[PDB]
Design a protein around this ligand. Structure first.
Ligand code: HEM
Ligand SMILES: O=S([O-])[O-]
Ligand SMILES: O=S([O-])[O-]
Ligand SMILES: O=S([O-])[O-]
Ligand SMILES: [Cu+2]
Ligand SMILES: [Cu+2]
Lengths: 660, 660, 659
């Protein structure tokens, strides 16, 4: 029936933490501390006290033992390592650095207190999604504070699912940007709704799923857009019923950590959400905490920090006397999301004994997860060269000056609330690509086909699934659950090889088993050309402003520029790169031949001068093209024409040489 | 006699965090200061010996005004959503760790850090950070004569009349700019004693006459002042013309006081301990209060003076029993943010973003010393991730500067290294030329300003350390000019000014709400009068380059004495207009010729030759565009490159001309 | 009477620490706290309890008083400083940042617990020599776990010297890479062996020295190689006896902190080793610690951190609740090793009052010591520009993918334990020379004599001594005790000036007194041509794959490329640089004159265009060669191809200007 997971039960039965032995809290101490919470929930959550433990769909407990220990094949990683004799535990993706929300008292003073002395950082931080990821009812002006009304069209979803009303919700998680979710007053993750009644008075039935409000489904993927995609992808779901387990009762409210009417996780905020979308309460001790649980108002009134606040990155009380000590976040708590791939291990016998080298990112079904930018960057040249998040990003102003969409006429949507209203993100950067890649920027600056595209538009497609909307993941088509920006940069040019592949445990192309990034010959992640050129998304401002790129679904270009498969994209690339690489090689061979001749042939001074001059001008051209390294993809006309001139330089020198 | 209204309101309704959370925050510091002021009202000699009677009124200035109200913090607070607009904002003056009111502390002193880090002790100890706080007997640069004239026999001593070393806890400062003193009661020295000696309670307490100023004592003689008056007719020459700002002898001005009219009554705790600190070894507060009033006792129990290792790195650093290691970002002492209602109002894009209307603390009409951080905050360097530590060594902040052997003063001694110096030469990790290669390359060619440093134009000494408003005539780029601006961007305009009065100003001399202007990119900028024609005696580059174009200090011919910004602007236009005109024709030429290369009627070899010439010309355009000074970095070289490109374009046109 | 050092006792008699006065432990507190340990050892170590205090060779106590205070002339530095009126102390090279191994309880949880949440960094750190510098018997698969049999040839050394058996060894220190040492079960540094019996039985005699297993002596420096070296360096030692006090009873076991049969340091791990090759125990208090001492098994059982583990760099407990506070190591605890040189101060009157500017590195006799990369880099352009270890190095994967020497057979050596078996190091870097030095890299990329060398091959010779094997230090010949890589970069071009020189106090070229680095006119350390080009070493994989470079000992090149002195190297450099500089000057002067002429001669527009084209293309060449700054040493053939073109350009423009 109802119990903690195996992993947790095994650690509880034989704990090897350090709190008692060393006076220092470590991973296993966090697994054990969670037991009272689950015991309290099995006795006091309405699902047991009012609904008799009955649900439409099976309840499935998912505590820190599964999230912090088992996730990302941490047991396989552990067995593959020498650490603790191959007998230890590995927390691949979900863990905290400091005390959890089960420890009272804590030393948090709240971001407003940091802001008294650091008013400048408070301002830029406070207009970011870090600051408002956790909010209370009354803090949603972007839907005029109507959490139970349709956001967009009147037949699509509200933020809160039916039967969940604001007075039984501790908080929402998320934004209009991508998705929302909710926590009830007992700090249980909202993996359910209530049909035929309300949670608030124990009426109706608890139903699994239909729990996660999804912007793209609600706004952009109408039945007519779905039917357009279905012309290309004959399995694409159109009717609500074709979304199946991933769906629900109304377009816009999908099932997440649940399958609709079939199963639902039963999970406290402590097991998972506190890692990345946190809050902290001001209670003196845990009794005060347990007495306030189940009362949304009392919990809210005692909330001293919401979301990714100053102290979540910099430590409770920062550097203040009596505080816990200053930290400077490297972001890996919430943005790394390592996941071990036995396939990457098996496929490269050179990696033997180095299970770190077979790390991938957490996948949500067939797409790399949101909050995986760190595990993605780990296998890039950038990271090898010492670059980290803070190299490029401002850590405070992470959302930027984005705004609402005035053209949307929805039932509750209000476009005028700044970033709260926005469908996009524009993080403030310390470094642009053009700061370090000057030759690429130079070629790209010459007026041509993509000369208005940002560097990011080809190099950082929106490959990541935040929603685990597997009903719409058709990855070989570079769509359609595409809400976060890949941090990989390297573009592979190949007719067939894919960035994203199924694990060897997969038995159907759509089962979603053990999907992972593939690695190229340099041991790095890469972006395939279907993602780079032809991806489909509604999260990409650059793409929206460049005619939807080459997506058969969102491109506004003529239809002969709609790219349907990677081989077609590859052949377009080849049409540009092959003549460029031919002229390049011709020049290189010409330069070498002429330097050989100059070592033995004697020429009149004015002719010697000219021959040398042409060789060196040809060399300037080939050095520039070689350093650029795109073989015409950063600007074909400038590139081809410059090389043509250089071939002609070589031809002139050869005539002069032949003459003498 | 009472604490300020601001401090009293917080005392009446405190909302700090020391009791509620075990963590000391801003409001706790306001509250803790009460006992000190109660003690000073009963025990300070002004009251116990002079009966409360002063020539000039006493105006209490505690943390309530310094750490809360300054920089228009209450206006910033009301403009913020933080705490519903009802909070407090510490804009410029606050500490990060315990104040000097908490005993015991964990400070061990810099000599102990020095035992294991002898290398950093050596570089730090020969810096002004190390000696900004000194005790009588530590002033070899004036032969330890604190009561005799430093320079000429008719100019000031460091300590004003009535103030003797034995009633002084310390001096603050150096010969570099200015000195001040604290009395043995740790009250700031905003007064002197006429017809008597403080130590005897004889004579009368007189407001002002309290801050020794190097520039007034040494450089600004009535002869120099008369020379200035010739250009600037309201410039003061006689001592009485210096008015409230002055005093009874040249070289002792009034600061935090107006001569015979008003004087601040302020403990060290309210203000100075933020930036020119000290720490005592007392085991508790009773020992501290028992020593107060005894200079020798305080001195003996002083464990840290000035900006010592632990002031940046934390009491005890990383040592066991220490308070935890810090790495200073310098904003404690070098930021000095100040909110400008005008910057908010003037730019409706800034609405709801009061951080964007931040300026720097002004000392009347000039940006204050220690505002390098609030200046750099609104620069491209800062946007690109650059911070103090990007360019500066944090230890060797003074450099190898020395005294002036040519000065013959009553007490000045020129042989004490940096103590004797008029200048500063901070050690740098990065020079402008390390990152700005095109600019450095053009600037390296022998020409008019090729021997100037980059910093000589880009970083003028715009900042007032002394608040010597008697001599501030900002439209003329003088004359209270002691610290170096960290702005870099130079605006090229006939009239627009860096520094402007606030809209509360009713007279050009009243100095109300002065602030920096912002350009179209939202950045601070340096006007041409500052960049080219400023008058200062703190700038060694300017002293070694014939005084630049200051009508007051220039040793150049008189037509190179620039008297207003329009004149400077016309000189800049004499260079940039022909450059920009030629550049423009070359660029249009290149584009036109490139487009005409698709005309038949052109021999192939003519076609290639045309290309070869416009290609070379494009190199010139690219260098000039990148440089971006339009000849200000080296007119002769810029002209040599453009003359070449003019020939290339005329030769290509000559060849094109045959087609017709 | 066995007692602590003069230096320790003087501080103990007049202590000026901060632990009692301020609640904060500082340097003098660490000196004071070492008393009980030495008193315990004088009473309880087998040297006294089983061998009656008798040893072949004099016992010389060396505690924190000498190591943490007197070393590197800290007393001279102190007297040259204004700090504490010239009357303070200065810890030049050996000191800790946080509690020593004398303080109990501590807050260490061990690297496996860090790695539970940081599995990635655990993996890379765990395959590095930081992780395994401290090991217990049982953990040496690279010798088939035979610490008492010969490693390599049957007539060379085992890791543990005779009389010393695994059961009375707490740990080894080191690797096959360079050398090993041991600590006995009482945590005394192994500066001795036992002849005629076993330490564990109290039989035999304690003999001084012959205590440090040395890879290069054991493997590479056979009597035939030594004879080859002797042909060039006549005083070079060939027979065991010619190694003298530095030597011992078997090739491969040298004397270190000891002179064979003559003297031996008596030193607890606390005095020196715990700075840089540390461990930590889990004991609740110092009683459990002392009760365990002398029992290797119980000490091992209670060892919670070994070697340079996560917490040694990051702090006990890291950032965890109840831990001691996160640190980010800047490496200077173990890799700096500053040493004050009164010669550098005296030779430069400008440095007066500034003793920091006369800092050098720890020397082990006549070679800069291992673990002095920091004091070296401190006087480099790179450091002046803000570069630190972490600019170039990954701090975790510091060993790299190096492997055993397959092809050598030895009685015990096992070549398939990966980095454990390896003779070399390949630290993972964040930045390569070529990332910042583009012009140099471009010229070096052109196929030519050295175009296949790494940048580091010439710029970072293996100048440093790990072993203090002074019997084989002949520094004017750039050999032969050469185990770690110099971090200096700047190459000086001179027929005679040397990087490494003897102090003023030296009275014999081989007495090894006060050796230091010389400083050039820019105030920096520099690499002389002998070290850069013709050095001899067995630690440099780049050199072994490039035919041994120009070493007369290891070079496989023709004998005319065996460089025997610096004057010869210099003459080879001048043969490249002189023609380059001559053409460069010709071009540069010609550009200048052409631009002047253009100001006052008139030409046909079409001629004028030509003169400009030729001058600008010559300028491009001048700017590249000048920025490169090697005057052909980065690629003579290409450098000459560019300058040959630019001489033509200028000649042709002068031709045109003549009419
Ligand atoms: C791409 C690899 C290398 C880089 C990045 C590099 C870098 C440098 C740099 C920055 C300098 C300073 C130049 C100056 O003073 O302006 C230099 C000088 C020098 N390098 Fe290299 N180097 C490389 C490879 C080599 C190799 C393989 C050798 C020897 C075969 C070598 C020998 C020298 C010498 C002898 C100098 C001194 C030149 C002089 O001052 O006269 N370098 N190198
Ligand atoms: O549930 S969060 O990973 O999108
Ligand atoms: O009083 S200080 O800001 O020059
Ligand atoms: O004994 S360690 O300095 O190679
Ligand atoms: Cu997500
Ligand atoms: Cu000042």
């Amino acid at each position: 029936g109802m119990q903690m997971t195996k992993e947790a039960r095994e650690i509880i039965a034989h704990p090897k933490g350090t709190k008692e032995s060393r006076g220092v809290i470590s991973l296993q101490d966090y697994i054990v501390e969670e037991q009272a919470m689950y015991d309290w929930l099995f006795k006091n959550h309405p699902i047991f006290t009012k609904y008799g433990g009955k649900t439409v769909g099976k309840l499935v407990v998912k505590d820190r033992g599964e999230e912090w220990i088992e996730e990302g094949r941490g047991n396989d990683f552990s067995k593959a390592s020498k650490r603790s004799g191959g007998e230890g535990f590995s927390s691949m993706m979900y863990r905290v650095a400091r005390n959890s929300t089960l420890q009272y008292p804590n030393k948090f003073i709240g971001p407003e207190k940091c802001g008294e002395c650091h008013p400048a950082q408070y301002e830029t931080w406070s207009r970011s999604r870090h600051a408002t990821t956790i909010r209370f009812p009354g803090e949603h002006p972007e839907v005029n504070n109507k959490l139970n009304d349709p956001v967009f069209d009147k037949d699509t979803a509200s933020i809160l699912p039916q039967g969940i009303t604001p007075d039984v919700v501790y908080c929402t998680v998320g934004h209009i940007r991508t998705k929302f979710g909710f926590f009830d007053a007992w700090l249980l993750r909202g993996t359910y709704h209530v049909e035929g009644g309300l949670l608030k008075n124990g009426t109706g039935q608890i139903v699994a799923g239909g729990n996660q409000w999804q912007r793209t489904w609600a706004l952009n993927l109408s039945p007519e857009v779905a039917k357009k995609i279905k012309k290309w992808v004959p399995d694409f779901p159109v009717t609500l019923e074709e979304y199946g387990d991933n769906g629900g009762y109304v377009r816009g409210l999908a099932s997440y950590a649940a399958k609709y009417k079939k199963s639902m996780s039963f999970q406290a905020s402590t097991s998972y959400c506190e890692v990345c979308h946190p809050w902290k309460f001001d209670f003196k001790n845990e009794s005060e905490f347990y007495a306030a649980l189940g009362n949304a108002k009392e919990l809210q009134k005692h909330t001293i920090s919401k979301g990714v606040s100053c102290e979540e990155c910099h430590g409770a009380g920062g550097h203040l006397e009596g505080g816990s000590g200053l930290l400077i976040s490297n972001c890996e708590r919430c943005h790394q999301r390592f996941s071990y791939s036995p396939d990457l291990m098996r496929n490269n016998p050179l990696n033997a004994g180095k299970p770190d080298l077979a790390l991938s990112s957490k996948f949500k079904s067939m797409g790399p997860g949101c909050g995986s930018e760190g595990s993605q960057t780990y296998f890039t040249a950038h990271y090898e060269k010492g670059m980290r998040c803070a190299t490029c990003h401002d850590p405070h102003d992470v959302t930027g000056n984005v705004t609402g969409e005035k053209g949307i006429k929805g039932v509750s949507y209000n476009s005028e609330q700044g970033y709260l209203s926005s469908l996009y993100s524009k993080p403030k950067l310390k470094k642009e690509c053009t700061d370090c890649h000057k030759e690429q920027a130079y070629i790209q600056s010459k007026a041509d086909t993509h000369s208005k595209n940002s560097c990011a538009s080809c190099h950082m497609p929106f490959m990541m699934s935040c929603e685990n909307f597997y009903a719409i993941q058709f990855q070989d088509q570079a769509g359609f659950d595409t809400q976060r920006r890949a941090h990989i940069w390297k573009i592979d040019v190949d007719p067939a090889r894919k960035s994203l592949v199924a694990g060897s445990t997969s038995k159907d192309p759509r089962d979603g088993k053990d999907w992972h990034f593939e690695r190229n010959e340099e041991g790095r992640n890469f972006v395939d050309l279907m993602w780079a050129c032809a991806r489909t998304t509604w999260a990409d401002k650059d793409q929206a402003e460049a005619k939807g790129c080459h997506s058969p679904v969102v491109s506004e270009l003529k239809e002969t520029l709609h790219f349907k498969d990677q081989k077609q994209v590859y052949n377009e690339v080849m049409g540009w790169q092959t003549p460029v690489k031919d002229k390049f090689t011709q020049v290189k061979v010409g330069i070498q031949g002429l330097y050989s001749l100059l070592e033995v042939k004697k020429l009149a001074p004015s002719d010697k001068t000219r021959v040398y001059e042409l060789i060196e001008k040809a060399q300037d051209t080939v050095d520039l093209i070689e350093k650029d390294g795109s073989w015409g993809m950063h600007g074909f006309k400038y590139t081809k024409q410059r090389l043509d001139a250089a071939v002609e330089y070589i031809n002139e020198a050869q005539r002069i040489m032949k003459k003498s």
